[PDB]
Design a protein around this ligand. Structure first.
Ligand SMILES: O=S(=O)(c1cccc2c(O)nccc12)N1CCCNCC1
Lengths: 20, 336
């Protein structure tokens, strides 16, 4: 399921901004 | 509306033109705990000894700000934050600096980050999401009317206050710009196609981000997610989005208009401005005035075991606050 894929992804934690 | 905005703009400009500075000292506060962390420094729960009030103090290492070339964005943040004033915007109580740091004392919002609650509960019901969305809609109408662009909307930057309402915090990328800008900034999942394609943009990016937020609050996950940022940008520019089978027809429509790759047909960026959004079906039950006044009943009220409680925030390692005996980056932060 989409939900499952998301939970197994490495981006479920607090996401940082990009400066560059 | 137009009448309101008009006055709000006059108040903003007075402070914008003449910002305040050095309105407190580090020793007027008691460092209690780290509430969150950033790239240039940590946000700490602090206590104003004199008033006995609690504040969220954002600390920025001047040298690190310079190494990351975030000087102007930092000045932008303090200058803008000290001049704005809206119900859903966290207030900056004091600001000051010392040999090595910059400080911004904001109001402490005990409720916690939407992020925490949203990730824990999984997803919000549409009505619940409509509640927060409405608040962002007005907050952007406010900000944009001031020629400001927020540029970093996301669950992580939205706090829930004691009344269950939203408080936008972190103006690290906010900018007052008439016309268009080109800086590549924001959070991957929330970036507008324009930004990713380095084509120069405007307020329209804030509306696209709104779409992303509403979708994440309603689905429990972003409309575009992958393991590496580059994979995310590829999804974003492809102008291809999939909606959960439970999304109402109205919701899907509002989102197809927000996550519009064509700036020519994206809600918020048309002749009807924000009204194309306020007057959208999905917001039919929404009484905008009632929302701005905070008369509507909050669907969720985070409770706290008293003042100073940080049970709604994660735990971070405690880093001591060291202040060089020598002034650092003085000329670069003169106006702070
Ligand atoms: O400075 S923050 O907006 C922030 C975090 C935690 C509690 C706060 C609080 O209670 N008030 C104002 C801002 C606060 N921040 C943490 C740094 C990373 N950006 C996301 C949120």
């Amino acid at each position: 399921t989409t939900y499952a894929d998301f939970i197994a992804s490495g981006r479920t934690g607090r996401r940082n901004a990009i400066h560059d | 509306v137009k009448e309101f905005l008009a006055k709000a703009k006059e108040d903003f400009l007075k402070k914008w033109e003449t910002p305040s500075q050095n309105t407190a000292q580090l020793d007027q506060f008691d460092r209690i705990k780290t509430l969150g962390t950033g790239s240039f420094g940590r946000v700490m729960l602090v206590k104003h000894k004199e008033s006995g009030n609690h504040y969220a103090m954002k600390i920025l290492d001047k040298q690190k700000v310079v190494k990351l070339k975030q000087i102007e964005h930092t000045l932008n943040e303090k200058r803008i934050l000290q001049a704005v004033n809206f119900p859903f915007l966290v207030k900056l109580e004091f600001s000051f600096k010392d040999n090595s740091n910059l400080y911004m004392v904001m109001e402490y919002v005990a409720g916690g980050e939407m992020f925490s609650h949203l990730r824990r509960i999984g997803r919000f019901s549409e009505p619940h999401a409509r509640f927060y969305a409405a608040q962002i809609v007005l907050t952007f109408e406010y900000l944009h009317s001031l020629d400001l662009i927020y540029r970093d909307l996301k669950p992580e930057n939205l706090l829930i206050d004691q009344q269950g309402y939203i408080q936008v915090t972190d103006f690290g990328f906010a900018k007052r710009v008439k016309g268009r800008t080109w800086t590549l900034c924001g959070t991957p999942e929330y970036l507008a196609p324009e930004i990713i394609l380095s084509k120069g943009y405007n307020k329209a990016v804030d509306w696209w981000a709104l779409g992303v937020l509403i979708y994440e609050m309603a689905a429990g996950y972003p409309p575009f997610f992958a393991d590496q940022p580059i994979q995310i940008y590829e999804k974003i520019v492809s102008g291809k989005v999939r909606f959960p089978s439970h999304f109402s027809s109205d919701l899907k429509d509002l989102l197809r208009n927000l996550l519009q790759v064509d700036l020519t047909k994206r809600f918020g960026n048309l002749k009807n401005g924000v009204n194309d959004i306020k007057n959208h079906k999905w917001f039919a039950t929404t009484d905008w005035i009632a929302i701005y006044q905070r008369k509507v009943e909050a669907p969720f009220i985070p409770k706290f075991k008293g003042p100073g409680d940080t049970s709604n925030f994660d735990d971070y390692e405690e880093e001591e606050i060291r202040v060089s005996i020598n002034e650092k980056c003085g000329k670069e932060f003169t106006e702070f």
